[PDB]
Amino acid sequence: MKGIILSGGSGTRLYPLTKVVSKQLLPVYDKPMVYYPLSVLMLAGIKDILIISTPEDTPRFEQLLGGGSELGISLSYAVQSSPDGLAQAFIIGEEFIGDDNVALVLGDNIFYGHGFTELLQRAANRKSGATIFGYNVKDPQRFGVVEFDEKGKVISIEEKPEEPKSSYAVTGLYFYDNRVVDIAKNITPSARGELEITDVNKAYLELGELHVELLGRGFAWLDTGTHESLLQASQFIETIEKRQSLKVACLEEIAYRMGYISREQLIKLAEPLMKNEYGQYLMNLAHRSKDLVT
Ligand SMILES: O=c1ccn([C@@H]2O[C@H](COP(=O)(O)OP(=O)(O)O[C@H]3O[C@H](CO)[C@H](O)[C@H](O)[C@H]3O)[C@@H](O)[C@H]2O)c(=O)[nH]1
Ligand SMILES: O=c1ccn([C@@H]2O[C@H](COP(=O)(O)OP(=O)(O)OP(=O)(O)O)[C@@H](O)[C@H]2O)c(=O)[nH]1
């Protein structure tokens, strides 16, 4: 499975934060926002990942993350010249996808909770259809809204409905089989002038092949849409990390835990960062007994 992080857009709502910085390089507490959705794909077992951003910002993501070899993965980059919609990811990414199945995650979405990896790995395992993730939000009209029956079968999906049919938003993580690329080429722009992921999902729903995993109330799903919500997301991650000996979305740690890189390789990453707490954390992990790490 391949993965794509869609990490463009103007971040209009966060102005002036986004005048000269990409929204997905802004902090969520202690790390750039993009580390969080990247860590999600990594934990899904996805090792071939394309990062899409603006003509100005794409070089900066590449400066941040590099080609992935440090992390035992492959990262590639592509430019979206104008933010013409989520579903344009599969058009830009057509050559990258090839014949493979693909997951899309939004560069501004933060998922957190116990058992998430197991849901991701199950979605990544599922060779046919589309899997989307529903979450009970306060204002479902702000999002895509998925309506499901008593067995969790999808009945409808609607982008920002005036009268929502459920309280479950469609979060910014989507798993598709290879049909998605041709689907994306055949949808047309909405009233807001975008190629809509909801219309990709509706194509799968027409075929009876849209599947929803519901993320229950024990999961946290944030987006970093506004100044307020961004600060809230930071506060949430700070609470979790302050209490624990473990970090969230520490990419090098995940590379090591997933066996993508060795203890020796992790030491080599930690060395030039020993001047800071992040390096120290990595070095403590690399020297930790292999039994304790398991
Ligand atoms: O062409 C684009 C369009 C958007 N984005 C980025 O993608 C993210 C999502 O965009 P919005 O915040 O505008 O979200 P939408 O209103 O497009 O909502 C979309 O994402 C939601 C989850 O956060 C729901 O899944 C919804 O159904 C889906 O349409 C933003 O960071 C945006 O900057 C791009 O990089 N390129
Ligand atoms: O090395 C890691 C592992 C996990 N995570 C993040 O921690 C959260 C929980 O990750 P899991 O989905 O592994 O659940 P958990 O660790 O609470 O449960 P155990 O299986 O360990 O008992 C998920 O949000 C995941 O993204 C990291 O950020 N880094």
From TrEMBL:
<feature type="binding site">
    <location>
        <position position="253"/>
    </location>
    <ligand>
        <name>UTP</name>
    </ligand>
</feature>
<feature type="binding site">
    <location>
        <position position="83"/>
    </location>
    <ligand>
        <name>dTTP 1</name>
    </ligand>
</feature>
<feature type="binding site">
    <location>
        <position position="144"/>
    </location>
    <ligand>
        <name>alpha-D-glucose 1-phosphate</name>
    </ligand>
</feature>
<keyword id="KW-0547">Nucleotide-binding</keyword>
<keyword id="KW-0479">Metal-binding</keyword>
<keyword id="KW-0548">Nucleotidyltransferase</keyword>
<dbReference type="InterPro" id="IPR005835">
    <property type="entry name" value="NTP_transferase_dom"/>
</dbReference>
<dbReference type="Pfam" id="PF00483">
    <property type="entry name" value="NTP_transferase"/>
</dbReference>
<feature type="binding site">
    <location>
        <position position="83"/>
    </location>
    <ligand>
        <name>UDP-N-acetyl-alpha-D-glucosamine</name>
    </ligand>
</feature>
<feature type="binding site">
    <location>
        <position position="116"/>
    </location>
    <ligand>
        <name>UTP</name>
    </ligand>
</feature>
<feature type="binding site">
    <location>
        <position position="8"/>
    </location>
    <ligand>
        <name>dTTP 1</name>
    </ligand>
</feature>
<feature type="binding site">
    <location>
        <position position="108"/>
    </location>
    <ligand>
        <name>UDP-alpha-D-glucose</name>
    </ligand>
</feature>
<feature type="binding site">
    <location>
        <position position="80"/>
    </location>
    <ligand>
        <name>dTTP 1</name>
    </ligand>
</feature>
<feature type="binding site">
    <location>
        <position position="249"/>
    </location>
    <ligand>
        <name>UTP</name>
    </ligand>
</feature>
<feature type="binding site">
    <location>
        <position position="170"/>
    </location>
    <ligand>
        <name>alpha-D-glucose 1-phosphate</name>
    </ligand>
</feature>
<feature type="binding site">
    <location>
        <position position="159"/>
    </location>
    <ligand>
        <name>UDP-alpha-D-glucose</name>
    </ligand>
</feature>
<feature type="binding site">
    <location>
        <position position="114"/>
    </location>
    <ligand>
        <name>UTP</name>
    </ligand>
</feature>
<feature type="binding site">
    <location>
        <position position="159"/>
    </location>
    <ligand>
        <name>UDP-N-acetyl-alpha-D-glucosamine</name>
    </ligand>
</feature>
<comment type="similarity">
    <text>Belongs to the glucose-1-phosphate thymidylyltransferase family.</text>
</comment>
<feature type="binding site">
    <location>
        <position position="23"/>
    </location>
    <ligand>
        <name>UDP-alpha-D-glucose</name>
    </ligand>
</feature>
<feature type="binding site">
    <location>
        <position position="160"/>
    </location>
    <ligand>
        <name>UDP-alpha-D-glucose</name>
    </ligand>
</feature>
<feature type="binding site">
    <location>
        <position position="85"/>
    </location>
    <ligand>
        <name>UDP-alpha-D-galactose</name>
    </ligand>
</feature>
<feature type="binding site">
    <location>
        <position position="85"/>
    </location>
    <ligand>
        <name>dTTP 1</name>
    </ligand>
</feature>
<feature type="binding site">
    <location>
        <position position="170"/>
    </location>
    <ligand>
        <name>UDP-alpha-D-galactose</name>
    </ligand>
</feature>
<feature type="binding site">
    <location>
        <position position="10"/>
    </location>
    <ligand>
        <name>dTTP 1</name>
    </ligand>
</feature>
<feature type="binding site">
    <location>
        <position position="85"/>
    </location>
    <ligand>
        <name>UDP-N-acetyl-alpha-D-glucosamine</name>
    </ligand>
</feature>
<dbReference type="GO" id="GO:0046872">
    <property type="term" value="F:metal ion binding"/>
</dbReference>
<feature type="binding site">
    <location>
        <position position="159"/>
    </location>
    <ligand>
        <name>UDP-alpha-D-galactose</name>
    </ligand>
</feature>
<feature type="binding site">
    <location>
        <position position="113"/>
    </location>
    <ligand>
        <name>dTTP 2</name>
    </ligand>
</feature>
<feature type="binding site">
    <location>
        <position position="160"/>
    </location>
    <ligand>
        <name>alpha-D-glucose 1-phosphate</name>
    </ligand>
</feature>
<feature type="binding site">
    <location>
        <position position="80"/>
    </location>
    <ligand>
        <name>UDP-alpha-D-glucose</name>
    </ligand>
</feature>
<feature type="binding site">
    <location>
        <position position="85"/>
    </location>
    <ligand>
        <name>UDP-alpha-D-glucose</name>
    </ligand>
</feature>
<feature type="binding site">
    <location>
        <position position="192"/>
    </location>
    <ligand>
        <name>UDP-alpha-D-galactose</name>
    </ligand>
</feature>
<dbReference type="InterPro" id="IPR029044">
    <property type="entry name" value="Nucleotide-diphossugar_trans"/>
</dbReference>
<feature type="binding site">
    <location>
        <position position="80"/>
    </location>
    <ligand>
        <name>UDP-N-acetyl-alpha-D-glucosamine</name>
    </ligand>
</feature>
<feature type="binding site">
    <location>
        <position position="8"/>
    </location>
    <ligand>
        <name>UDP-alpha-D-galactose</name>
    </ligand>
</feature>
<keyword id="KW-0808">Transferase</keyword>
<keyword id="KW-0460">Magnesium</keyword>
<comment type="function">
    <text>Catalyzes the formation of dTDP-glucose, from dTTP and glucose 1-phosphate, as well as its pyrophosphorolysis.</text>
</comment>
<feature type="binding site">
    <location>
        <position position="115"/>
    </location>
    <ligand>
        <name>dTTP 2</name>
    </ligand>
</feature>
<dbReference type="GO" id="GO:0000166">
    <property type="term" value="F:nucleotide binding"/>
</dbReference>
<feature type="binding site">
    <location>
        <position position="117"/>
    </location>
    <ligand>
        <name>UTP</name>
    </ligand>
</feature>
